[PDB]
């Protein structure tokens, strides 16, 4: 993907615009590029926090149901002190679509509703007057989207949009909204990697863009002690005798990439950490060492702010996950706020990154109701859509490629390999993301009905990734069914590939305060059962090298009669209290030793 | 007490009449007596079940709260195959006061509201027609009632009922009415009394009221294999080698009593355990060999038919109890239906069998708003006081004194002792029990306030139990100063006293469905970690034989703002589902070796 590193603070600057309060109002009937509203102050608005999703800010299901266009606004005074700088506005997540205007240039756009986008904006402000950020936000889906959907529009035109994820189509600025300064030469990107032996020493080779100038690089300590040093655009290798970056504890040395022009410098850190993630055989190694997954499938949402990033929520949640035990997570059907990225990074949490490629199936929704027959075919799943979703994995790519806690790729989650054509859609996505980044594997999320004699894409990816439910969608209730078909399924895609298999989801739906002396489902009791079952099958098989329960938290979905006020699967309640099966994986994931599988 | 024994069917039977649907009407403004509405059918009536509450059966709170006398009334036909015969109507529960008319003619009157009484009509009636009973029912409790309590009429004279003990004032007929039938030779009343020795073998004297006429008896086996043999109004003196009433599984002989006449026979078959109670030092032996109890403190109490008797709720709530490791439990603040003590009988269920004798204490009640200053005064706990108590002890020990599972006598709740007069009042009291029947110890149950260094009256009983509440009331929310207090009042009680130490109630209120990691007060996890501190220091010491936690199910109550709905300190909830201490419990007290204490 273009160019883009997260903003970071060196003796240049960025002033956050996250001031939450925006004017908003909803186009209705898009009436809104017709009269430019970008060209006047906002009419009949009310005011809206900037991040979080508009759906439940103001507790009215019709915005909260609302297809269409939205529009934010906001004045802001550029400092004057940054006069003969470049000033660049950088959006960190407007989610599904997004334009905007400073004041009356538009300068940037985007499709990608996870991932930030920038332009250079230096030639329409300048510093010392106040300029009024006008943003087109649009929530729609199509075929073409990443992930899809289906507008439909009824008799009187009103839109209600369609899609066939499980989690809420949320909405808005979700993330950081930032004016920042960089000197006029550019250190626009750089890309690291690592290698080591047998933990005694090795090197990072390295590559940079440095748009304006030349270029010295300082890799320095915890300490900041300078351990080595590199010359040149490229290259940039220096040998070590490192402390490494490991699971439990996740030591990040400092990359400092300086740009000298002949009048400008630019310094820009970059953390880094000395890992070498690889498979072998059925084995998934970390520093040449056999590793464990434990953890969870997560969402981003809560109660009042959506999918808005909150770093209370991400310090308590974290709390929460270091308690419980779990080592791993994988940010389950989007990309998530690099915050969370930068927090695995410091703290050594593992991390299975996805892009927001789900609901390319169409046999998961159930019930008694026009989808299209073809997956893979024109009208739906089409050669657009192919270019879109290697788009989607070029940005994730090209943001979260440094960071030590990213392990793995994964392109997409439950996607139907039975109707011909998925093979021939996924597999040009997965060599291009190979040579996107050789460094880490790729993973492709396996759904439960794509068994292992069915399923037709899984031989082009590194490692397995299984969703499995059995006890919950089929063998309903049956412990003793579920157990031995669980286990036999297991077996099979280990004899089928030679993978190493991660169960990335596995979950029931739980009614905090449901208890049940008969063991039933949706019980407390249940919950743990169920679990306690899955992981003796994954105690006896080999091949598994990972555990993540579907959902830490519930949280929110479309209306359905198989979602009780959204989905609860999760081990702790939407406002984070936990149910009883949270205190049956602590006891487990604190009882094993560290990154080590259970030997039963 | 009067002479009573329950009726069983031999070849003299019973007809049951808790046909349920009786006419009920409640009398508003004592019209009832004036009228004698016991003359013709009731007055516009209502559809009343009995046995069950009145209260809650018509989910009106008008009802619900009423203070005063409500009427049934029902026809029954007399079988004629009864001509001859001695017919009696016993009611087995009619709470607080009742009297009755066959038609017009008053048969029977009573003040103990769970306990039975009969009179015999056989010259009232004549088989063949049916006549109509009519019962008033009162409800109000002075101070000379067991238990007590202050009626109050407001300004415009309506009732309301005060009392000052937990659970809400159910009444009603709360259990079976039953006409019966038996031969005109009267076996009115048996005793048994066991003896043991080294489990070998020993003997059961015995004692008989059987008004008309000679006496043989057989004891018979489980094959009903004859083993001994007697004759005689009393001694009836055998001995035996037998397999001796145990807790873990309750062998029950059959003393079949027969009473022959010179033209009339009767025989009454009588289940006995040779089972032997007794207390030495700080053990609590049963066959010579020391008991832990485990288990529960109850209630009659269920979620429509109040205090009614029902026989799937005694057949569950012993599949809860059985299932989670419970060996014996204290009928909670009133006799029980006798069907539970035939039941523990049967099955080994020890049981603390406790009189009505609740409430005399005026230290409990906590909030901010006319109670007696002095508790043992004239106008409080007075001399008529004392002699309805030595009458209340006096039924319950008539009632079950030949059961196995009943082990001791418990004759009060939580008094306070503190006020001069106390001992005064209590100390007659015991000493009358003891001599009402020698064969079980002799408890009064400890309140928290009345700490070992306070405490007045414990010297004058057998066996000290306690209901302790560190951590709730007091030391709120602290599990590190409750557990002191806790320890050193319990080694403080037995450096007074010596004797066997029964926590007999300890629990805290757990909301089902409120969870938190905080561990704070409401919470399950709060029920946990304190039931599992105060495990720690019971199995620290030595004198403790006993645990029983407070409730085994949420019960009602007065409303108050200390009472969410009711007392909510179960291990189940009214509906008898789990909280998460519900399987703390069972892992320990099936943990542990049957009626052995955990060495630590
Ligand atoms: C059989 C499909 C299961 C499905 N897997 C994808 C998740 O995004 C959903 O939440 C989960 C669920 O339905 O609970
Ligand atoms: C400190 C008194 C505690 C009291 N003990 C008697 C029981 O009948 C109540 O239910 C119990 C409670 O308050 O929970």
């Given at each position: 993907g273009s160019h883009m590193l997260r903003p970071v603070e060196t003796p240049t600057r960025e002033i956050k615009k996250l001031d939450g309060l925006w004017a908003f109002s909803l186009d209705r009937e898009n009436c809104g590029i017709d009269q430019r509203w970008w060209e006047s102050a906002l009419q009949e608005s009310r005011a809206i926090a900037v991040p979080g999703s508009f759906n439940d800010q103001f507790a009215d299901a019709d915005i909260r149901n609302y297809a269409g266009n939205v529009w934010y606004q906001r004045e802001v005074f550029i400092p004057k002190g940054w006069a003969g700088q470049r000033i660049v506005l950088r959006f960190d997540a407007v989610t599904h679509y997004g334009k905007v205007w400073v004041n009356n240039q538009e300068v940037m756009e985007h499709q990608g509703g996870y991932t930030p986008f920038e332009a250079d904006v230096t030639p329409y402000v300048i510093a010392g007057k106040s300029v009024r950020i006008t943003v087109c936000v649009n929530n729609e889906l199509n075929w073409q989207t990443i992930p899809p959907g289906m507008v439909i529009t009824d008799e009187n035109g009103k839109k209600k949009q369609s899609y066939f994820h499980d989690f809420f189509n949320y909405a808005g600025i979700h993330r950081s909204v930032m004016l920042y300064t960089t000197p006029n030469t550019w250190v626009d990107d750089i890309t690291v990697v690592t290698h080591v032996a047998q933990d005694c020493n090795h090197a990072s080779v390295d590559w940079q863009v440095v748009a304006n100038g030349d270029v010295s690089v300082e890799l320095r300590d915890a300490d900041?002690?300078?351990?080595?040093?590199?010359?040149?655009?490229?290259?940039?290798?220096?040998?070590?005798?490192?402390?490494?970056?490991?699971?439990?504890?996740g030591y990040l040395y400092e990359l400092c990439v300086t740009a000298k022009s002949q009048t400008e410098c630019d310094i820009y850190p970059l953390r880094v950490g000395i890992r070498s993630v690889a498979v072998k055989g059925e084995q998934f190694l970390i520093n040449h060492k056999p590793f464990y997954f434990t953890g969870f499938g997560?969402?981003?949402?809560?109660?009042?702010?959506?999918?808005?990033?909150?770093?209370?929520?991400?310090?308590?949640?974290?709390?929460?996950?270091?308690?419980?035990?779990?080592?791993?997570?994988?940010?389950?059907?989007?990309?998530?706020?690099?915050?969370?990225?930068?927090?695995?990074?410091?703290?050594?949490?593992?991390?299975?990154?996805?892009?927001?490629?789900?609901?390319?199936?169409l046999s998961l929704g159930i019930g008694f109701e026009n989808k299209p027959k073809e997956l893979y075919s024109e009208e739906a799943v089409n050669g657009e859509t192919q270019q879109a979703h290697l788009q989607a994995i070029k940005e994730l790519i090209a943001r979260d490629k440094n960071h030590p806690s990213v392990v793995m790729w994964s392109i997409a989650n439950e996607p139907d390999t039975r109707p011909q054509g998925a093979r021939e859609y996924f597999a040009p996505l997965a060599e291009a993301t190979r040579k996107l980044d050789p460094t880490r594997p790729i993973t492709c999320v396996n759904v439960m009905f794509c068994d292992a004699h069915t399923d037709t894409i899984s031989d082009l990816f590194d490692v397995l990734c299984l969703n499995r439910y059995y006890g919950w969608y089929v063998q309903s209730g049956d412990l003793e069914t579920a157990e031995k078909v669980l286990e036999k399924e297991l077996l099979a895609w280990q004899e089928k590939l030679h993978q190493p298999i991660i169960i990335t989801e596995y979950g029931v739906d739980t009614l905090a305060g449901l208890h049940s002396m008969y063991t039933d489902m949706w019980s407390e009791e249940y919950q743990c059962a169920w679990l306690d079952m899955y992981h003796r099958v994954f105690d006896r098989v080999s091949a598994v090298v990972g555990e993540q329960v579907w959902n830490f938290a519930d949280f929110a979905t479309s209306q359905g009669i198989l979602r009780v006020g959204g989905n609860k699967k999760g081990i702790f309640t939407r406002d984070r209290k936990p149910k009883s099966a949270a205190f049956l994986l602590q006891k487990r994931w604190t009882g094993m030793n560290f990154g080590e599988k259970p030997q039963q």
């Open positions: 900041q002690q300078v351990v080595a040093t590199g010359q040149g655009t490229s290259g940039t290798l220096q040998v070590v005798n490192p402390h490494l970056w490991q699971p439990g504890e997560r969402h981003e949402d809560a109660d009042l702010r959506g999918k808005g990033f909150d770093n209370v929520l991400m310090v308590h949640d974290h709390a929460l996950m270091d308690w419980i035990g779990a080592n791993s997570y994988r940010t389950s059907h989007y990309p998530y706020a690099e915050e969370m990225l930068d927090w695995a990074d410091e703290h050594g949490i593992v991390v299975i990154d996805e892009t927001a490629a789900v609901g390319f199936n």
